[PDB]
């Protein structure tokens, strides 16, 4: 029951405790439970990603189903079969609800407009290295709930944070 007419911009990411979210063009862990959670949050909404995050999805899974896929690139002729390609965030955020799904550069671009963050914290020890993609560091305007730790089937421990701001 949200009145029509507004544009909710959310960020969603999964990070190691160190803040690492990406390395070698991939996510350096596998957490099917987090993929299910990611699908549930974003389903039915527009999803915006950087060109490198588009490249990081296997060809056989993209575009992600049930969502309008939007890819941010400076290459006007970039080929993202089944997605919209835009050259700035100006016209990427026009839906009633948009989820920015990564990666490092696009989170920083969209953070100023975001009022929700859905964060998965993965208890993996990965100290930051040169070239890693990192999560945004939220400031004090954000408030939210910290979920309980839970074990994935692989035995990796993780928890969900749901943050909001006005
Ligand atoms: N939750 C997670 O853990 C998570 C989620 C998503 C992604 N990732 C990972 O994060 C890493 C990718 O993140 P990243 O920071 O390296 O790249 P990215 O943010 O996904 O995409 C970067 C690209 O976006 C375009 N871009 C950036 N700023 C732009 C601007 N102002 N205007 C127009 N286009 C702009 C450029 O594309 P062009 O070069 O084509 O011009 C830039 O190369 C990968 O390792 C991925 O696996 C992790
Ligand atoms: C589930 C990862 C994730 N998790 C969270 N919490 N936030 C995010 N932005 C986020 O990234 C979504 C974009 C990258 O997707 C992936 C990368 C590497 C392996 C597996 C997937 C999942 C597949 C491709 C799928 O969803 O179909």
Curated annotation (Swiss-Prot):
Signal sequence annotation: none
Binding site for substrate: 12-14, 34, 39, 67, 107, 120
Keywords in alphabetical order: NADP, One-carbon metabolism, Oxidoreductase
GO CC, alphabetical: cytosol
Cysteines engaged in disulfide bonds, as pairs: none
Name of the featured protein: Dihydrofolate reductase
GO terms classed as biological process: dihydrofolate metabolic process; folic acid metabolic process; one-carbon metabolic process; tetrahydrofolate biosynthetic process
EC number: 1.5.1.3
Reactions listed under catalytic activity: (6S)-5,6,7,8-tetrahydrofolate + NADP(+) = 7,8-dihydrofolate + NADPH + H(+)
Organism: Mycobacterium tuberculosis (strain ATCC 25618 / H37Rv)
Matches recorded under PROSITE patterns: DHFR_1 (PS00075), DHFR_2 (PS51330)
Family: Belongs to the dihydrofolate reductase family.
Binding residue positions for NADP(+): 13-14, 21-26, 50-53, 72-75, 87, 101-106
Function: Key enzyme in folate metabolism. Catalyzes an essential reaction for de novo glycine and purine synthesis, and for DNA precursor synthesis.
Pathway of action: Cofactor biosynthesis; tetrahydrofolate biosynthesis; 5,6,7,8-tetrahydrofolate from 7,8-dihydrofolate: step 1/1
MF terms in GO: dihydrofolate reductase activity; NADP binding; NADP+ binding
Gene expressing this chain: folA
A Pfam family the protein falls into: DHFR_1
Superkingdom of the organism of origin: Bacteria
Activity regulation, short description: Inhibited by isoniazid metabolites. The prodrug isoniazid is metabolized to isoniazid-NADP adducts that inhibit the enzyme at subnanomolar concentration.
Domain DHFR, residue spans: 8-165
